[PDB]
Symmetry: D2
Subunit: 147 residues, 4 copies
């Protein structure tokens, strides 16, 4: 029985961290659309639960839950889910450390956005090239076309 | 009334040349599907007129037809077609040129072949890379995804 | 100018310093100087860290001022200051940090994958440029790149 | 014995064609700089000779030369140099044909020019990407770097 776990994650972006782990865990087994929908459903549950524990933005949480993959759907036995909670005030040291993790992932996101912009510029060139190579075949040769 | 004319071309690769020229005079107005179809249709009509002339494959020929574009479609009155014939033995000098032409044009194809090989081999990476970026986005960021 | 690492497990403290050094200096110094300066201080730490008897599992905080001077990195060691946290004390913290390490190393594998592709690409590009030229030489009266 | 020959080529184009044929013939045997100098050297020699013959722009020529590769240089027996000329009024039919092959090859170049623009633009992204990858290595990982 496979198991999602987030480990120590600042509440601020617990939502992200479960999904991130969900993609990682189910890679290849399920379609991405399902991964988002599934994590979305759980994330909405752990939110209302987190409020019942009176959790603030700054606190650090922890998440364990079991799920099974069945004909390309992610189903979890919700009662196999457990949340641990850590008030910043109690574990001030850990709680800071977790803002540091957060900020260094926000920093990261800028880098990816850069990369995305390049890979985009590239598939663009790639298309324009491959497109043109054909346009030559047409006008300058008698080779087999793509028609 | 626009028109296609081929220019001096060896009988050997007459079929190719007419298709080459057609794309040219019709870029961005027609579709390749409609062009490749009409270029096969009109060159069959030439071929039956071509055996009718008794013209060999070492010879040289001039082709000029009128044509018209109708809602993306390609249409031509055939009694506008005009084929000139030039026997090898008569212009032994001319025919030798269209043979050297044809050879280098084929020699060119082999280079295009490698280019296509390169273009695709790239477009693979282009796609693998862009897809890896998504895979990163999903696993390592809170960024919006192709998926959502 | 001040590099600080914040909470990092003792094991990958080496990396963290350099990683951040690159970040802070980007553009201002050649990379060769970043590795040299980083390694120089990283040793100075390692030694000064053993004197305090720090295992690999413990967590640490490191702050040192430095100066960019005619393209070189100089730091006054006096400004350097190290906090040290025993796993025994912060069992909760030290886990979180180990958790980061695992994740950071999991990440390395993705990068390697990406490089693998960028390389395969640079190669393909170099070939295409190389071939495009060879076309110009054989089929055009165009100007070449050796005239 | 290696032997560069152009075949039928309009007077205007001779210059290129020989250089093109020299590259194609001596592939991987000599550095391009040598080829372009060598073609450069012969091409001026054949120009002088081409004026003596009184050849106009429109006429067609054929060229043959013997040459040998020595230590990475291209040397030719210049007395092996053999030219033929075909004034337009004599082969009026051939001259027009070689004119069309000229204008065609020029319509071609505008394409290679475009392709080149793309190849470059690409090479650039390759460089930018491949660099971005290194920056990630140094900033986000403890992997081995190009700087160790």
């Amino acid at each position: 029985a496979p198991k999602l776990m987030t480990g120590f994650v600042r509440a601020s972006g617990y939502a992200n961290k479960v999904r991130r782990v969900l993609f990682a865990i189910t890679r290849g087994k399920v379609f991405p659309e399902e991964v988002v929908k599934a994590a979305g459903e759980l994330n909405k549950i752990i939110f209302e639960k987190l409020q019942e524990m009176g959790v603030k933005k700054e606190d650090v949480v922890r998440i364990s839950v079991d799920f099974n993959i069945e004909d390309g759907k992610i189903v979890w036995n919700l009662d196999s889910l457990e949340i641990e909670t850590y008030k910043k005030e109690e574990e001030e040291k850990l709680a800071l450390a977790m803002e540091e993790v957060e900020h260094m992932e926000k920093m990261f996101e800028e880098t990816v956005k850069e990369l995305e912009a390049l890979s985009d510029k590239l598939r663009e060139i790639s298309k324009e090239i491959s497109e043109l190579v054909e346009r030559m075949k047409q006008e300058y040769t008698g080779l087999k076309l793509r028609s």
